[PDB]
RNA sequence: UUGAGCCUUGAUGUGUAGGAUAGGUGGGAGGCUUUGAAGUGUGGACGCCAGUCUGCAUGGAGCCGACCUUGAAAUACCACC
RNA sequence: GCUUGAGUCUCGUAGAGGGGGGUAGAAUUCCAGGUGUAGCGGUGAAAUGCGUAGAGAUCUGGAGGAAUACCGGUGGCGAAGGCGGCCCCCUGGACGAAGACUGACGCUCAGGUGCGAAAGCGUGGGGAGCAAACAGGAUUAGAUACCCUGGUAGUCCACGCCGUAAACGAUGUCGACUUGGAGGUUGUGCCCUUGAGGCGUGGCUUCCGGAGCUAACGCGUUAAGUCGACCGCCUGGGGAGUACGGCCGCAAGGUUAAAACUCAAAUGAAUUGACGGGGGCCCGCACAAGCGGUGGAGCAUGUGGUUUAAUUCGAUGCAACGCG
RNA sequence: CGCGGGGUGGAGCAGCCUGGUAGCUCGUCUGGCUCAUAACCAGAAGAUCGUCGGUUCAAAUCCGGCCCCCGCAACCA
């Protein structure tokens, strides 16, 4: 429990699903919560409203660390990615700085084939 | 349709009491094309529900309505193969009919001897939040509620009032 | 799924109707489920001409052959009859 | 992509350069090599431009309205 | 049998907004007149973004 | 670092009823306190979110038991656990 | 003999031109460790799959392989195939300015020789990611498929082979001549570089259009216009680029290349319709919002069938079936 | 042949590591959805907690006896 005061907020935010996970300065997880977690299945995961639930449902069950304020890292082109930090916004933190952290290969491995 | 917003007409209030929603909900329960015993059962039954209610008519109609009105209704869309429901609010002129609806056919349904007498108790119960139609009113609100992560494109309700 | 025949000016014999029959049974198993079919067989001093009507789910389809000598008639418009039944099923499907 | 700043911040800043240039390259690279078809798609895109600038070049005429 | 609805103007608006999700990044299929060319590309504008919220 | 066992201690034990986070059994109107009182500068535990323990006062000389509700009367006090 | 064709030399200029060597960053995968716990992943929906033996996420470290975001430009170089991080070494070609030099040394080329994407084959390494075959889950009437989860050859390197591609500009090479415009790129000359300025000049290249040509589509100074030199190839469609024989190849197969038979067509371009599970726009009890029905029942009426001596004849998708 | 553990919806099991009211997926039943089946979603009943006893106010929970399992053994007449 710690008595944590400032955390690092990443949201990995693919396509099928968003999770998000408040961890601290240092790296290591204090708490997590999915948007697959939160009653959403299947496609209902892939909505922005799902990740907005599952900033609620991360925010609290990290208040034990007791959080005054967060970075937020922001991985994946998803639909959730902007209504998770309304819900970080909302949920009662102070957003120190966002990044970007969707990782761009100067192309490196192949991608696979996938459609038809 | 695809045209027409259409010239729209109005409707005769009641006769005992000052109200056209009253009306509205004779004419729902007007059943075959007969209004006079229609109006004979809703008299009869707001009768009952003033001796089993003990407050006035009006206002026991209108407080036992309230409690089945409801404000976010599904309206099913399939997207692919997927279709599933997406909550669009519900415009209040909708609003109480649809309540009414449920309240006329939730009394034909309940049966009792008579006609007043089921609808009365109905009325009671709806006051009471205990009948058939808050059981359709929660229903609608649970999966409307259920299925709230739908806002979208262009289909319905656009910008605002 | 009833197949119900008629005739103008064909005598619908009984191996006739034995034969139509099994062909379109095999056909509505093999395809979509088929609710009522008619057949009208037509004769007009050469052509051996044949009609059907199935109602299914979506609604009605038909087809028109016309033949040389009655059995070749049915056969066509029963090819054409799957033929339309296959784009009317994933019609329906197009997930 | 990196929003720090004072009190009024947070939002337009972010999800504009953010979204232009995260959703273009992802959404580019998340499937299909091709190694084929960006030479296609780069020829009838040009194609294209040529052709919507000297459309409206052209269309610079007159419309009756 | 009455009377077009909402006349043209945000019509031509929805049909900006249907042609902007559905793809159509043409921007190339509007009106002509200068009151629904600029709601058609309004929709238009107002679709892209309902594009990025969602795949 | 870490189990496990053994002592010495110290906290914890809100069903219902209700003045109340009363564990059982037995004894049981005597200790608390100016070895500087109820409130709180204070700081936590527990937390079945309502009440109990202890840290330091700037205050300073006060509290319950039998007598109200319970299958039960009070960590009022003590013993065995 | 001559210098205009061709070639050489002195300066530069740009360039993913080639061969060899080295190195950098991001990312993917795996392994070890930390924090942490109930899901992850995937789809049009799902399941197979992975996870309480601690997954997914997050952080630190390490290993290995492959490709080089941005720059990136209907830009560049190459005979074509093709060639993109950055640096070094060795090396080919093109271009232009000013001169000098040789003096027709030129063009094309059957046979021949050389180069020749990808797949594949042989030997030896290497193997991240992807991915035929294969397994499984779906989908479907079936689904040896598309979709998903995995996954071996191969993709990579070194050395040989194969010698084909929609190897395409579906346009052989070389040369001359014949109205314009807008651009790109790369040199260079003069003048007020006095200001990203103006006027010319060469090369390569993109589009639009003129006459002319073409069956039309379209081509149009980089021609499919007007001509000249040389070469390759065609002679109805199928059989057939197949068989037999030769030559090459480890094989797969490549090249050369028939005939019997059979048909009166096959084809190219354009037109008018029709059609599309193509697009745009508008509308309809088309859907949505509702009310009442049919299908269950009895009866009436019509039809098919069956019957009969006859059950008169016709009407049969919508648009026949209380119809004449 | 004596030790341990289990008896709870149809089934798998939580509850009972401190006595106060029976709980979750499926199967089974509606309803919405779908062209229908499906998938999704929302509700509902589903047990006198293996049977007799007793231990205190009150026992699925604590303790005896019986039955049924599953293991460990003892298994050298």
Redesign the pocket.
């Known amino acids: 429990r710690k008595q944590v005061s400032d955390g690092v907020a990443?949201i990995?935010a693919?396509?099928?699903?968003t999770?998000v996970?408040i961890?601290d300065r240092q790296?290591?997880?204090?708490?997590?919560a999915?948007?697959?977690?939160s009653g959403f299945?299947?496609?209902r995961?892939?909505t922005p409203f799902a990740a907005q639930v599952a900033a609620e449902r991360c925010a609290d069950a990290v208040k034990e660390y007791g959080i005054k304020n967060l970075e937020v890292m922001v991985?994946g082109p998803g639909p959730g990615r902007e209504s998770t930090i309304r819900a970080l916004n909302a949920a009662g933190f102070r957003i120190t700085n966002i990044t970007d952290v969707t990782?761009?290969?100067?192309?490196?491995?192949?991608?696979?084939?996938?459609?038809? | 349709?695809?045209?027409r917003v259409i010239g729209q007409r109005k409707i005769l209030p009641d006769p005992k009491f000052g109200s056209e929603l009253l009306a509205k909900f004779v004419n729902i329960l007007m059943?075959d094309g007969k209004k006079s015993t229609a109006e004979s059962i809703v008299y009869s039954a707001l009768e009952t529900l003033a001796q089993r209610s003990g407050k006035s008519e009006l206002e026991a109609f209108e407080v036992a309505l309230e409690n089945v009105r409801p404000t976010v209704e599904?309206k099913?869309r399939?997207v692919?193969?997927?279709?599933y429901?997406v909550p669009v609010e519900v415009r209040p002129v909708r609003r109480n009919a649809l309540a009414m609806?449920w309240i006329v056919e939730a009394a034909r349904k309940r049966g009792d001897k008579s006609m007043a007498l089921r609808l009365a108790n109905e009325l009671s119960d709806a006051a009471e939040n205990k009948g058939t139609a808050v059981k359709k009113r929660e229903?609608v609100h649970?999966?409307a509620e259920?299925?709230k992560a739908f806002a979208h494109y262009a289909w319905l309700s656009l910008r605002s009032a | 799924m009833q197949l119900?025949?008629?005739?103008?000016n064909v005598e619908?014999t009984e191996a006739l109707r034995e034969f139509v029959t099994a062909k379109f049974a095999k056909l509505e198993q093999?395809?979509?489920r088929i609710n009522q079919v008619?057949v009208?067989l037509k004769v007009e001093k050469v052509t051996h001409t044949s009609?059907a009507?199935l109602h299914v789910?979506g609604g009605?389809l038909?087809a028109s052959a016309e033949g040389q000598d009655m059995y070749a008639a049915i056969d066509g418009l029963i090819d054409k009859l799957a033929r339309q039944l296959?784009?009317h099923?994933?019609?329906?499907?197009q997930? | 992509i990196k929003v720090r700043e004072n009190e009024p911040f947070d939002v337009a800043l972010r999800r504009f350069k953010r979204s232009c240039e995260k959703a273009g390259?992802l959404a580019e690279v998340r499937r299909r090599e091709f190694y084929e078809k960006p030479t296609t798609e780069?020829?009838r895109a040009?194609?294209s431009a040529?052709k919507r600038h000297?459309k409206k070049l052209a269309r610079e005429n007159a419309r009756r309205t | 049998?009455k009377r077009?609805?909402r006349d043209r103007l945000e019509?031509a608006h929805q049909?900006g907004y249907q042609?902007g999700i559905?793809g159509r990044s043409k921007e190339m299929?509007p009106y002509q007149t200068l009151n629904q060319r600029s709601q058609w590309l309004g929709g238009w504008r107002e679709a892209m973004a309902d594009r990025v919220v969602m795949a």
């Open positions: 990443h990995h693919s396509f099928n699903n999770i996970t961890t790296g290591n997880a204090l708490g997590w999915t948007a697959g977690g299945r299947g496609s995961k892939s991985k990782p761009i290969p100067h192309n490196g491995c192949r991608p696979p084939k996938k459609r038809r | 349709p695809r045209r059943v599904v099913s399939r692919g193969g997927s279709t429901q609806r229903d649970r999966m259920a299925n | 119900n025949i008629t005739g103008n619908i093999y395809f979509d008619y009208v009609d009507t789910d009605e038909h296959t784009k099923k994933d019609k329906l499907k997930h | 390259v780069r020829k040009k194609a040529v000297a | 049998m077009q609805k019509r049909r042609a559905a299929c």
